[PDB]
Design a protein around this motif. Structure first.
Motif, PDB file in Angstrom:
ATOM      1  N   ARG A 172       0.907  -1.602   0.252  1.00 35.03           N
ATOM      2  CA  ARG A 172      -0.116  -0.164   0.070  1.00 35.03           C
ATOM      3  C   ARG A 172       0.995   0.972   0.168  1.00 35.03           C
ATOM      4  O   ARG A 172       0.411   2.030  -0.858  1.00 35.03           O
ATOM      5  CB  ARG A 172      -0.830  -0.269   1.355  1.00 35.03           C
ATOM      6  CG  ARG A 172      -2.379   0.507   1.310  1.00 35.03           C
ATOM      7  CD  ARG A 172      -2.571   1.092   2.592  1.00 35.03           C
ATOM      8  NE  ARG A 172      -1.791   0.581   3.755  1.00 35.03           N
ATOM      9  CZ  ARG A 172      -1.924  -0.514   4.307  1.00 35.03           C
ATOM     10  NH1 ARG A 172      -2.616  -2.009   3.187  1.00 35.03           N
ATOM     11  NH2 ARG A 172      -1.301  -0.585   5.576  1.00 35.03           N
TER      12      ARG A 172
ATOM     13  N   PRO B 182      -0.227   7.894  -1.005  1.00 39.39           N
ATOM     14  CA  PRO B 182      -0.959   7.259  -0.156  1.00 39.39           C
ATOM     15  C   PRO B 182      -1.534   7.756   0.502  1.00 39.39           C
ATOM     16  O   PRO B 182      -2.490   7.459   1.613  1.00 39.39           O
ATOM     17  CB  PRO B 182      -0.463   5.565   0.436  1.00 39.39           C
ATOM     18  CG  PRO B 182       1.033   6.046   0.019  1.00 39.39           C
ATOM     19  CD  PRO B 182       1.164   7.433  -0.854  1.00 39.39           C
ATOM     20  N   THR B 185      -5.768   9.545   0.674  1.00 42.20           N
ATOM     21  CA  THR B 185      -6.021   8.643  -0.070  1.00 42.20           C
ATOM     22  C   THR B 185      -7.565   8.792   0.513  1.00 42.20           C
ATOM     23  O   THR B 185      -7.889   9.180   1.703  1.00 42.20           O
ATOM     24  CB  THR B 185      -6.154   6.506   0.396  1.00 42.20           C
ATOM     25  OG1 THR B 185      -4.573   6.912  -0.808  1.00 42.20           O
ATOM     26  CG2 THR B 185      -7.170   6.020  -0.198  1.00 42.20           C
ATOM     27  N   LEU B 210     -11.301   3.581  -2.920  1.00 41.37           N
ATOM     28  CA  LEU B 210     -10.651   4.352  -2.616  1.00 41.37           C
ATOM     29  C   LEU B 210      -9.891   5.211  -4.063  1.00 41.37           C
ATOM     30  O   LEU B 210      -9.588   4.571  -4.457  1.00 41.37           O
ATOM     31  CB  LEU B 210      -9.393   3.706  -1.601  1.00 41.37           C
ATOM     32  CG  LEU B 210     -10.139   3.130  -0.630  1.00 41.37           C
ATOM     33  CD1 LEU B 210      -8.867   2.366   0.639  1.00 41.37           C
ATOM     34  CD2 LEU B 210     -11.401   4.295   0.457  1.00 41.37           C
ATOM     35  N   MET B 212      -6.000   7.503  -4.899  1.00 42.68           N
ATOM     36  CA  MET B 212      -5.184   7.522  -4.010  1.00 42.68           C
ATOM     37  C   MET B 212      -4.483   8.428  -5.163  1.00 42.68           C
ATOM     38  O   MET B 212      -4.264   8.414  -6.239  1.00 42.68           O
ATOM     39  CB  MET B 212      -4.569   6.241  -4.293  1.00 42.68           C
ATOM     40  CG  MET B 212      -2.837   6.179  -3.820  1.00 42.68           C
ATOM     41  SD  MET B 212      -1.809   4.722  -3.705  1.00 42.68           S
ATOM     42  CE  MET B 212      -2.688   4.097  -2.056  1.00 42.68           C
ATOM     43  N   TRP B 232      -5.389  11.111  -9.238  1.00 43.65           N
ATOM     44  CA  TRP B 232      -6.427   9.754  -8.771  1.00 43.65           C
ATOM     45  C   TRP B 232      -6.251   8.621  -9.454  1.00 43.65           C
ATOM     46  O   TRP B 232      -6.420   8.107 -10.738  1.00 43.65           O
ATOM     47  CB  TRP B 232      -8.032   9.960  -8.380  1.00 43.65           C
ATOM     48  CG  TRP B 232      -8.060  11.591  -8.145  1.00 43.65           C
ATOM     49  CD1 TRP B 232      -8.325  12.601  -8.385  1.00 43.65           C
ATOM     50  CD2 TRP B 232      -7.675  11.671  -6.853  1.00 43.65           C
ATOM     51  NE1 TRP B 232      -8.112  13.983  -7.664  1.00 43.65           N
ATOM     52  CE2 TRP B 232      -8.253  13.330  -6.497  1.00 43.65           C
ATOM     53  CE3 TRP B 232      -7.407  11.158  -5.250  1.00 43.65           C
ATOM     54  CZ2 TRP B 232      -7.909  13.953  -5.277  1.00 43.65           C
ATOM     55  CZ3 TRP B 232      -7.272  11.825  -4.350  1.00 43.65           C
ATOM     56  CH2 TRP B 232      -7.085  12.870  -4.212  1.00 43.65           C
ATOM     57  N   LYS B 235      -7.958   2.651  -5.971  1.00 40.20           N
ATOM     58  CA  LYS B 235      -7.997   1.406  -4.878  1.00 40.20           C
ATOM     59  C   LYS B 235      -8.895   0.773  -3.931  1.00 40.20           C
ATOM     60  O   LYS B 235     -10.028   1.374  -3.984  1.00 40.20           O
ATOM     61  CB  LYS B 235      -6.924   1.723  -3.929  1.00 40.20           C
ATOM     62  CG  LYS B 235      -5.769   1.577  -4.015  1.00 40.20           C
ATOM     63  CD  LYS B 235      -5.234   0.185  -3.373  1.00 40.20           C
ATOM     64  CE  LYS B 235      -3.654   0.274  -3.385  1.00 40.20           C
ATOM     65  NZ  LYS B 235      -3.145  -1.124  -2.796  1.00 40.20           N
TER      66      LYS B 235
END
Ligand SMILES: O=c1[nH]cnc2c1ncn2[C@@H]1O[C@H](COP(=O)(O)O)[C@@H](O)[C@H]1O
Ligand SMILES: O=c1[nH]cnc2c1ncn2[C@@H]1O[C@H](COP(=O)(O)O)[C@@H](O)[C@H]1O
Ligand SMILES: OC[C@H]1O[C@H](O)[C@H](O)[C@@H](O)[C@@H]1O
Ligand SMILES: OC[C@H]1O[C@H](O)[C@H](O)[C@@H](O)[C@@H]1O
Ligand SMILES: O=P([O-])([O-])F
Ligand SMILES: O=P([O-])([O-])F
Lengths: 830, 830
Positions: A172, B182, B185, B210, B212, B232, B235
């Motif tokens: 991640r 990250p 996010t 999501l 990120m 963007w 995720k």
């Protein structure tokens, strides 16, 4: 501060400016918006900088000198965090601690931010990780080869007392340790068919998936050697995965790329259990096909890709290459090596087979039938047509060997076949590995004997020279110096630091067994460890424990053979005895049980629910007080193990005799000051043998007794009938004492225990609680308990993976270990 | 060497050691195994290092000063390569050229290794990229917001004369320019339903994906300003995308994550064409939902997230925020802004609407019906239930406004509705943008007038103040200094360097129109450019062209409205005339046609096949010799455009009058020394107006003539009947002259041309070839051709995107541009 190295003046200053360089140029942040995660990355990048120089010269070195290469193939590499371990092996811990301190940061707080590299399930994956560290420390030109799963073992969550699984997105935030090497991407084939034309067979019309490598550095302990762990990632070709034209949709074609790439998406969460899914088989071939091309490319260069006899003579292949099979998962390496040599290089069958058997070796890890890999032929037939043909041919010639050795033994022939007939035809991968390897080993003395007497008896009679033993070990760096610096320091105070890479030296601690200051110190670090764990518990998980009680811990994967259930029975027995005589004194205990259950393992998940259910009752009974607490350790993983093991007093290794191949957690506890209560199973035998049975708490059936019972026939009712305390517990579970709202919740456990217990829990019950009373008695005498602890620690030296690796090297790989410091890391730019 | 900056002593030395630092520590390579790709990355990382310092202070600055923020929302950002452009804007080109030279490397060779950032289709995506560069150069606190597609516009391959599409894996080797964030996010919701409870509506039971962010730096031209482009990435959450329990499979659940993540997987390859797919709508909401939360978070901090009136008063929102809609793709920003304000912040409808209309502005790019976004209500209904409700309510109140202004005009009511009735109900996104924006603009004067007279006439009558014009422009940095340093140098020799950020100054070149040395120089750089392109052609694509011939080039997306077909007709006419009188002299020409066709656009793909088919015949006719060559430029993209444009002599802008909104490639050719042959369409009118019609080759119907013809009724047969040369060409196509093996291959083109030509190709044929004869005549007089070229270059200043951006800033955003150098990049670490 401790012997975490020197906190030099020049180096602490150098570390600090580089920390700031990265925080600015690499993370693109400014101190005013930087969070602990940013700080962790600045540090990680700073530490990684120190081993790239050594990494480059180590690899350049092997290219110049050209020694025999060791390839450790495994589908699992349970690495854990890598920041601290790198600091430890580079003697950077104190300097980094100082530098970050001066930067106004707490290094320990930053270390907790690193995500674990959980690309493993349990014992098998961690062994591979410990081996990698030892091979680097012993200066072997070794390479770890595996799969870079983007999702490792699932993160376990306990909801309502039940395990909940959730994706482990360990990438991640990024991985500062790996180095993507897209330039060394290789193609791997699947499906297709086999054409037999004039001069050889051809694997044709295949589907291509690309394997992109990612290298992670593996530093040896303070010797300047930095080996490589290459992990493959699946990538779709941009042609056919788009170019196979004639309607379907351009968008859909691009979205469908995530079909070839699913191969490296997730690790199968099965521990000692075989699941015959197509995705697993694809992962297994994927790692094997990619790794071998790499192995041959490196060999073709060597010094043959210069001169030597001149003529790609693969006769020297086994002199330059050694490939170790970690279980049967990478077993397709055998028929794949044959396919390349025969189909591509055009060697005759017999020459190719000689080469293959001479470079391959196989390691077995379990004797339970459900763990054995038996792949349906129709699967191999569709996915890997040519490999099936090669396997049939290998079987044909092998069986001719058997018939010639045992004339007329027609049953032996069917028993040894690589092909299993029946419902569906299957290929026995283990039989394949024995046939195509020059060495087969067990992971503990008794396990290795069991292989020869039972499971692989026919193969042993055919070729006795192939079977060996290599007792497992653990790395004293991560499992002692890294997780228990306090203990490592007081040992160093008396015998020095050389034991870190020569664990046998711990024996010298035997002469301090009556030393008053040492006993006090050993006892002090354990107390400090327990206090720190008891704190972490309330910090991250919340709801108190008592640090003065005996820390009873059993942490490993949840299995019926590991018998967490037998542990449960004891816990309930203690509870019932307290409730019977409340005002009687008993040694306080905090029993911690932790471990993950495979998602589809219903019984294992039911056991986790029983543990929490017992805790719900026991932990809230006022009469019990602080004398007994039952806690389930959530998300047991490597980083969690580094915390509980140093804090344990009692280690539980209670599997049914003959079922645990070796076990390694047991070794972790022994080296960290815990006493062991267990059965004569796996490495437990060798440990009690090393420390003396008097300093070990052995109980229960031996392998012989289990077999005697099976001849007779195991009847649990008998035990239920003759043991009132046991009867009382089963009736408590049956009537809902531990599950009021759902009284029949644990009917499957009781049913199983009474009618289908394959691991005879009741048969070891009486001796187990009797034995548990004996450890309680000894805990009441702090001085004697500690003296026995010193006897275990001082005698654990044999269980270092350096010893295991040195044996593999000499008796299997044919290479000599070397504790020689590589010529410094020093700059250089040719 | 050129004015690519200073090659200072201290800086060339600094660049070199940093190049080596990265090659060692970042790439983990040693000079002995380093390839050109490694060298390119070492350089890229070295150059990127120089703008992180400026990037951090630019952003910190905007946080301190807190000026009005400009958010440019676009689903397309056609960036191209970013190494050279960064060097150019940081005045690092000569220093890097020197340093790499001393390192023994060719910088130009390393630049070719960088993959293009092809996150765009054509005109619209490149405009956004040129705008970003200009906003940074004019010191505006501007942010580019979009989607980070892992696959940009497909790479075009020509097989057998047909286009073949293949995935553009531009991230394969990594992107050294972006910075994953990250930590920022954000969650985006889909589906669910709407609950109406007591105090407001609630969007409930939604699926969460999501977003990120990834930031890429956008440096202004030599002013130390480094703005941000936030892209963007989709995720999957690790909970519900695994946690929604009760059977399905743990493995499958993890593999299914690539269902939420497909949202940002690939860019839709459609140029000026609408495709109502669910995946597109999800991309559109995804970028809007994520961007807005970011916009509001930044506003809540500002100086209100300190004090100010104290009470989150969104009254000042429009004073601090401006969001520009690049076409209707991000149009859901309007109802999304309302949803947040009304549903979450709890503002009354009217206050919220006032705020929304005041901060939003919309840019229209085309008038063709098939390009208009009309989303079926059932789609919006299922995916975005609350947004549909808000849209209905916006429509209700808007229509009440109309009824009140035009009492009894019942047809006007249905015409202006945001909701379209019929087969399936649809939402007209363009009507939505006009209603919820305080400004609506065209991209060229005639296009903006057409919007007011035709397509949006009713809306113009309702609110005339909303409609504006903002003629498109291109950045003189990438489209002059970067791709044509030779031309930039000789201009600088006479008028200095200030024109790079003040293009109007090129007018001063008008006084050198009779200067003998300049004419010779202008003519010399064009010749050098042609020689370099002719070389690249044989280098990378292979099969000779003649650099002395007239370079006739038409490069843009393949469309029926762009009329590559009208170009084809001329090429065939030239061929037939040569074959009729072989020994007659004609000006040699190399006509190059390049561009991509959308995968599902059958007619466009048939046109690419016709072009190559013509080349097959023309290029192999011995009688033709070197007088005429037909080449199809493969994979036309930004980096390819930087190569052909500087080498062109004739620019083809021949769309049917009234169909090309503006066009920007035309501007690229004008500033680089090409003469233009085109129709009075788009910006062509303003260009001929600026250079003088005498220095432009205008032909064909004007918008009025097209309309006259439509009243009458277009009959292609008429033209076929009265023009023998045209008749001869159609019969050649019909009989297989250009397709021997498949004689009926081009029946669809002939059928279309004769019976369903929406763009009346035949109607402009006679005037087009007549006009083409006139450019040939002028090319025969090198001195006069060059003098006319100087007249175009010297008058192209108006077409800089700095002028366009300054107008948007003043007349729409309400901000003042500033050519003030930000306070150096200088170290600093607070
Ligand atoms: O052809 C070669 N010339 C020089 N050095 C090489 C060559 N091949 C490998 N090396 C060195 O050996 C290290 C091992 O590379 P690998 O084992 O093939 O991945 C490299 O990073 C280089 O230092
Ligand atoms: O709360 C804050 N304190 C100090 N600086 C901030 C704060 N928020 C933003 N900044 C600065 O503003 C830049 C803009 O961040 P963003 O626009 O929110 O992404 C940051 O990188 C910081 O330098
Ligand atoms: O050999 C490594 C490990 O492999 C498996 O996990 C076995 O169950 C275990 O007994 C052994 O210690
Ligand atoms: O405004 C930018 C561009 O948008 C579209 O691509 C239009 O077709 C084109 O005419 C215009 O130049
Ligand atoms: O779970 P174990 O410790 O036996 F590996
Ligand atoms: O294709 P265009 O140059 O009109 F944008």
């Amino acid at each position: 501060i401790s012997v975490r190295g020197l906190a030099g003046v020049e180096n602490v200053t150098e570390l600090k400016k580089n920390f700031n360089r990265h925080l600015h140029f690499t993370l693109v942040k400014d101190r005013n918006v930087a969070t602990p995660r940013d700080y962790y990355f600045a540090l990680a990048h700073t530490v990684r900088d120190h081993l790239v120089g050594r990494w480059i010269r180590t690899q350049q070195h092997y290219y110049e000198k050209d020694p025999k290469r060791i390839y450790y193939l495994s589908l699992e590499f349970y690495m854990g965090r890598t920041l601290q371990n790198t600091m430890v092996n580079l003697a950077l811990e104190n300097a980094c601690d100082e530098a970050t301190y001066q930067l106004g940061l707490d290094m320990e707080e930053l270390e907790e931010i690193e995500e674990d590299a959980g690309l493993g399930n349990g014992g098998l994956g961690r062994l591979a990780a410990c081996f990698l560290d030892s091979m680097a420390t012993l200066g072997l030109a070794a390479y770890g080869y595996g799969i870079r799963y983007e999702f490792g073992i699932f993160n376990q969550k306990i909801c309502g007392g039940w395990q909940m699984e959730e994706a482990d997105d360990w990438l991640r935030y990024g991985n500062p340790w790996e180095k993507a090497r897209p330039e060394f991407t290789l193609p791997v084939h699947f499906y297709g068919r086999v054409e037999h034309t004039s001069q050889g067979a051809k694997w044709v019309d295949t589907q291509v998936v690309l394997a992109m490598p990612y290298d992670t550095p593996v530093p040896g302990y303070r010797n300047n050697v930095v080996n490589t762990m290459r992990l493959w990632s699946a990538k779709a070709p941009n042609d056919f995965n788009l170019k196979d034209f004639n309607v379907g949709g351009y968008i859909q074609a691009v979205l469908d790329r995530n079909l070839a790439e699913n191969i490296s998406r997730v690790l199968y969460p099965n521990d000692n259990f075989f699941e015959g899914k197509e995705l697993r088989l694809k992962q297994e071939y994927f790692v094997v096909a990619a790794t071998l091309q790499d192995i041959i490319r490196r060999f073709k260069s060597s010094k043959f890709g210069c001169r030597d006899p001149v003529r790609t003579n693969f006769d020297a292949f086994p002199d330059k290459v050694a490939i170790q099979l970690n279980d049967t998962h990478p077993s397709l390496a055998i028929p794949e090596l044959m396919r390349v040599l025969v189909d591509l290089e055009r060697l005759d069958w017999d020459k190719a087979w000689e080469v293959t058997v001479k470079t391959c070796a196989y390691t077995n890890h379990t004797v339970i039938p459900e763990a054995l890999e038996r792949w349906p032929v129709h699967l191999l037939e569709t996915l890997l047509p040519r490999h099936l043909q090669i396997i049939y041919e290998i079987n044909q010639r092998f069986l001719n060997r058997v018939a010639a050795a045992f004339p007329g033994d027609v049953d032996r022939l069917r028993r040894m076949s690589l092909v299993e007939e029946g419902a569906v035809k299957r290929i026995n991968m283990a039989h394949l590995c024995i046939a195509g390897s020059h060495a087969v080993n067990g992971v503990a003395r008794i396990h290795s004997e069991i292989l020869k007497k039972t499971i692989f008896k026919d193969f042993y009679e055919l070729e006795p020279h192939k079977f060996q033993n290599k007792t497992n070990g653990i790395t004293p760096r991560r499992w002692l110096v890294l997780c228990n610096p306090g203990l490592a320091e007081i040992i160093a105070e008396r015998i020095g630091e050389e034991y870190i890479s020569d664990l046998d030296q711990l024996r010298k601690l035997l002469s301090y067994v009556d030393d008053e200051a040492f006993i006090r110190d050993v006892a002090k670090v354990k107390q400090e460890n327990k206090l720190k764990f008891a704190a972490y518990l309330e910090r991250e998980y919340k709801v108190h424990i008592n640090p003065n009680s005996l820390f009873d811990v059993q942490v490993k994967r949840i299995h019926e053979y590991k018998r967490q259930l037998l542990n449960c029975l004891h816990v309930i027995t203690l509870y019932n005895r307290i409730k019977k005589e409340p005002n009687k004194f008993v040694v306080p205990r905090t029993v911690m049980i932790g471990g993950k259950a495979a998602p589809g393992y219903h019984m294992a998940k039911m056991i986790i629910k029983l543990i929490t259910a017992i805790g719900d009752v026991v932990n809230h009974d006022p009469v019990v007080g602080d004398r007994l607490r039952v806690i389930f350790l959530e998300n047991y993983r490597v980083s969690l193990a580094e915390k509980v093991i140093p804090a344990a007093d009692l280690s539980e290794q209670i599997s049914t005799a003959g079922t645990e191949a070796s076990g390694t957690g047991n070794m972790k506890f022994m080296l960290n000051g815990a006493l062991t209560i267990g059965t004569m199973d796996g490495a437990n035998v060798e440990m009690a043998e090393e420390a003396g049975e008097e300093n070990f708490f052995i109980f229960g059936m031996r392998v012989e007794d289990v077999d005697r019972l099976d001849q007779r026939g195991y009847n649990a009712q008998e035990y239920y009938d003759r043991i009132p305390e046991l009867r009382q517990i089963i009736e408590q579970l049956s009537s809902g004492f531990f599950s009021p709202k759902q009284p029949d919740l644990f009917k499957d456990i009781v049913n199983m225990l009474m009618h289908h217990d394959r691991f005879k829990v009741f048969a070891d019950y009486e001796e187990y609680v009797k034995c548990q009373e004996r450890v309680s008695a000894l805990y009441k005498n702090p001085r004697e308990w500690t003296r026995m602890v010193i006897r275990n620690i001082a005698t654990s030296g044999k269980f270092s993976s350096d010893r295991t690796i040195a044996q593999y090297a000499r008796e299997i790989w044919g290479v000599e270990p070397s504790r020689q410091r590589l010529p410094a890391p020093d700059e250089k730019i040719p």
